[PDB]
Amino acid sequence: VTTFVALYDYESWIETDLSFKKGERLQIVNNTEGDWWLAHSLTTGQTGYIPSNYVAPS
């Protein structure tokens, strides 16, 4: 539906976060409410929380 792209690298020490590379495609699992979103990587297949301000619709 709506695909998002990472705007910056994100590496987290919280293992339930999704870490990702600038340019990687991600998707939202729930909705766009909140500053932290449950997300899924379209490249690694992993699911985890991400900061909303690190991604944009592509």
Numbering used by the authors: 83 to 140
What does the paper say about this structure?
Cellular Src kinase (c-Src) is one of the most representative members of the Src-family kinases (SFKs), a group of non­receptor tyrosine kinases that mediate responses to extracellular stimuli, phosphorylating a broad range of downstream substrates. Although v-Src shares 95% sequence identity with c-Src, this kinase shows uncontrollable activity that is responsible for the occurrence of sarcoma in chickens. A number of these mutations are located in the SH3 domain, which plays a critical role in enzyme function by facilitating the interaction with partner proteins and providing the formation of the closed inactive conformation of the kinase. Here, the crystal structures of three SH3-domain mutants of v-Src were determined to unveil the effects of these oncogenic mutations in this regulatory domain.
The v-Src SH3 N117D-V124L crystals belonged to the trigonal space group P3221, with only one SH3 molecule in the asymmetric unit. The overall fold corresponds to the closed-monomer form of the SH3 domain. Meanwhile, the distal loop conformation differs from that present in both chains of c-Src SH3. As expected, the most significant differences are found in the RT loop, in which the oncogenic mutations Arg95Trp and Thr96Ile are located. Nevertheless, in v-Src SH3 the substitution of threonine by isoleucine prevents hydrogen-bond formation by its side chain, and in this case the type I β-turn shows a hydrogen bond between the backbone atoms Ile96 O and Asp99 N. However, we could not obtain the intertwined dimer structure of v-Src SH3 bearing the oncogenic mutations in the RT loop, even with crystals obtained using the same crystallization conditions. Instead, we only obtained the monomeric form, and both mutants had only a single molecule in the asymmetric unit. The reason for the lack of intertwined dimers of these mutants can be found in the role played by Arg95 and Thr96 in the stabilization of the dimeric structure. Neither tryptophan nor isoleucine can form interactions to stabilize the intertwined dimer.
